[PDB]
Amino acid sequence: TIKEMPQPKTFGELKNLPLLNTDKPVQALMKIADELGEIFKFEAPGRVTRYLSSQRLIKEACDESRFDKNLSQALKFVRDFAGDGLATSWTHEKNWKKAHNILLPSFSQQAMKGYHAMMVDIAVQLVQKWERLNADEHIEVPEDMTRLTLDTIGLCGFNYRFNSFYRDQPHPFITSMVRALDEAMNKLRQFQEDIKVMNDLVDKIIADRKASDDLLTHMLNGKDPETGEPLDDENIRYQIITFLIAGHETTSGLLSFALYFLVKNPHVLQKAAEEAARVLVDPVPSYKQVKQLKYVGMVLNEALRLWPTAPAFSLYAKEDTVLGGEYPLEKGDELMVLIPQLHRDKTIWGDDVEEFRPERFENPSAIPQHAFKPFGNGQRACIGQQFALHEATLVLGMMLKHFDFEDHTNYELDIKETLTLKPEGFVVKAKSKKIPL
Ligand code: HEM
Ligand SMILES: [Zn+2]
Ligand SMILES: [Zn+2]
Ligand SMILES: [Zn+2]
Q: How far apart (Å, rounded) are the C-alpha atoms in residues 347 and 16?
A: 29
Q: What is the CATH number of the domain that holds 316?
A: 1.10.630.10
Alpha helices in 83-214 (DSSP H): 94-103, 109-131, 141-158, 172-187, 190-210
DSSP state of 235: H
**What region does 37 belong to: left with phi over 0, alpha with psi -120 to 50, or beta?**
left
Q: Among 84, 236, 254, 382, which is best to mutate for testing ligand 1, by the most ligand atoms less than 8 A from CB?
A: 382
How many C-beta atoms surround the C-beta of residue 10 within 10 A?
Answer: 13
Q: Are strands 47-52 and 334-338 parallel, antiparallel or unpaired?
A: parallel
Residue numbers of the domain that contains 2: 1-437
* Helix, strand, coil tally for the chain in percent (to 5): 55, 10, 35
Q: How far apart (Å, rounded) are the C-alpha atoms in residues 27 and 24?
A: 5
Q: How far apart (Å, rounded) are the C-alpha atoms in residues 72 and 11?
A: 22
Q: Is 309 in the pocket of ligand 1 (CB under 6 A)?
A: yes
Is residue 430 classed as helix, strand or coil in its secondary structure?
strand
Q: Compute, in angstroms, the gap from residue 334 CA to the centroid of ligand 2.
A: 15
Q: Compute, in angstroms, the gap from residue 435 CA to the centroid of ligand 4.
A: 65
Is residue 51 classed as helix, strand or coil in its secondary structure?
strand
**What region does 159 belong to: left with phi over 0, alpha with psi -120 to 50, or beta?**
left
Rounded-to-10 torsion of CA 162, 175, 140, 115: -30
Instruction: Say which amino acid occupies 139.
Output: I
Q: Is 116 in the pocket of ligand 1 (CB under 6 A)?
A: no
Greatest alpha-carbon pair distance for the chain in Å reads 67
Q: How far apart (Å, rounded) are the C-alpha atoms in residues 106 and 86?
A: 14
Of these residues, 49, 149, 242, 250, which one is catalytic? 250
Quick check: 150 and 113 in contact, CB under 8 A?
Answer: no
In this structure, which ligand is nearest to the CA of 315? Answer: 1
**What region does 322 belong to: left with phi over 0, alpha with psi -120 to 50, or beta?**
beta
Q: Does the active-site annotation cover 375?
A: yes
Q: Does the active-site annotation cover 243?
A: no
Kindly give the number of the ligand 1 atom that is closest to the alpha carbon of 391. Answer: 27
| The total number of structural domains that make up the chain | 1
Q: Compute, in angstroms, the gap from residue 183 CA to the centroid of ligand 3.
A: 36
Q: How far apart (Å, rounded) are the C-alpha atoms in residues 84 and 100?
A: 12
Please tell me the experimental approach by which this structure was elucidated.
Answer: X-ray
Nearest to 326 by CA among 100, 18, 50, 131: 50
Contacts of 258 (CB under 8 A, 6+ apart): 299, 300, 303, 392, 396
Kindly give the number of the ligand 1 atom that is closest to the alpha carbon of 243. Answer: 29
Resolution, in Å, please? Answer: 2.1
Q: How far apart (Å, rounded) are the C-alpha atoms in residues 195 and 27?
A: 28
